[PDB]
Amino acid sequence: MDLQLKQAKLRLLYFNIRGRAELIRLVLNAAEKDFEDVRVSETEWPSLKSKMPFNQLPVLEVTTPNGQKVMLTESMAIARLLARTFGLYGDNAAEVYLIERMNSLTSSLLEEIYALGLKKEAEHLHEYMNAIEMALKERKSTFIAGPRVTLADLQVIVLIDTMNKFLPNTKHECKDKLDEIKEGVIRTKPGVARYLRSRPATDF
Amino acid sequence: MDLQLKQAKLRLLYFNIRGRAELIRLVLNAAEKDFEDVRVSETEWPSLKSKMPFNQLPVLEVTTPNGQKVMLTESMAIARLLARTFGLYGDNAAEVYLIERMNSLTSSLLEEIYALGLKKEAEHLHEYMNAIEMALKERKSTFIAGPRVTLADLQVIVLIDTMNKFLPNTKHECKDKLDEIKEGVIRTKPGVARYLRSRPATDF
């Protein structure tokens, strides 16, 4: 039942984009936990989908220290499990509420931005951006949920990179407040700083 | 920072439907924690939205035992906070992964069902239903995450009621496995059993 994730061998299977696995890559790099970052092309996906017991990516393939292979699914469930394992998910339920309130807003905004890339909404987008900006201005701590980085600050990085690609010229005050969080993650999580500098430059 | 939710006065503001607040109502009734279940019409929403500091429902208005009024937002963040407070969120990160994997599947399926009511997909629906049915058949416990009810078993109830309204004649084997979970929640959580019997019969 306990996968012993600190020691376990970890392989992340996803496409060669940031997308919905970037948050997992950021948690593992923040924790300085090594993993195989396996980037799958859509040319390779049909054959991989046929031999493996899953139908969507990302999957985290865990090999426990005792040799047991377990395939984990559901991107945010994986990210939260890894964050809890490596001390990136707060210390009590009140802090976790702050994490999860912000992640609800930023996850929803991410999915709205993703859906508008090729469909053809600044109002629905503005609503999320105002809520995020408001929470960031009201906080009484350096990071979203307290004095130290948690999963919510890591997902802010995902959100910034998505707004830069999908909404480059959008000029909302929330962008500056998000960038402040990112600056603090880079300062305090040298594994993230190095990863962002070295990761593949991708469009999405 | 700690709202003292066991003792705090709680008012839930949402529309007079099950919708996205039913999970919160189920947690509180499972815990036998009293709350004001305030059901707002769309006739009343414009005026309420103008005087209060929020722009969407549900909101949980908490009055702590020391008299402090705090408005909580984000339906799933509220539900998880309440589940943690009342012992409905497992005991370790491995159990929580089981909760959150299942809630990812059932939340996604719920949102897909909601979006298809008036838009005009059995494939995308079938994918979620097969994954849910598969996890339910593979489990080595009475409930989704272990021997006792958690938030994931409560959201199964939300999913059943939604499939009954939106997909009455759909005949998938996952429906029976979901109904088994619901039967066990009713048996083991007398507060849920009573609530389901007494709650307003609504369309959505």
Residue numbers in the entry:
A (entry chain A), B (entry chain A): 1 to 120, 129 to 212
What does the published report state?
Two crystallographic structures of rTs24GST without GSH (apo form) were determined at resolutions of 1.30 and 1.75 Å and analyzed. The second structure at 1.30 Å resolution was determinated using the rTs24GST 1.75 Å resolution coordinates as the initial model for MR. Moreover, this structure lacks the loop connecting alpha helices 4 and 5. The second region has the highest B-factor values in the overall structure and is located between residues Leu116 and His132 forming the loop connecting helices α4 and α5. In this region, the electron density is insufficient to build any model. The crystallographic structure corresponds to the apo form of a sigma class GST. These structures were determined in a C 2 2 21 space group (number 20), and in both cases, the asymmetric unit has a monomer with Wilson B-factor values below 21 Å2. However, the diffracted crystals obtained under GSH co-crystallization and soaking conditions did not show the GSH molecule bound to the protein. An analysis of the available space at the G-site in these crystallographic arrangements revealed minimal space for GSH to reach the site due to crystallographic contacts, which reduce or even prevent the success of crystal-soaking experiments with GSH.
Sigma class glutathione transferases (Sigma GSTs) are key regulators of Th1 inflammatory responses, making them promising targets for development of therapies and vaccines. This study presents the first report on the crystallographic structures of recombinant 24-kDa sigma class GST from T. solium (rTs24GST), which were determined at resolutions of 1.30 and 1.75 Å. The structure of rTs24GST shows a typical GST folding with the thioredoxin domain in the small N-terminal α/β domain (residues 1–90), and the larger C-terminal comprising the α-helix domain (residues 91–212). Finally, a 24.3-kDa GST (Ts24GST) of medium abundance, belonging to the sigma class is principally expressed in the scolex and exhibits low activity against 1-chloro-2,4-dinitrobenzene (CDNB) compared to Ts25GST and Ts26GST. rTs24GST is an enzyme with low affinity for GSH.
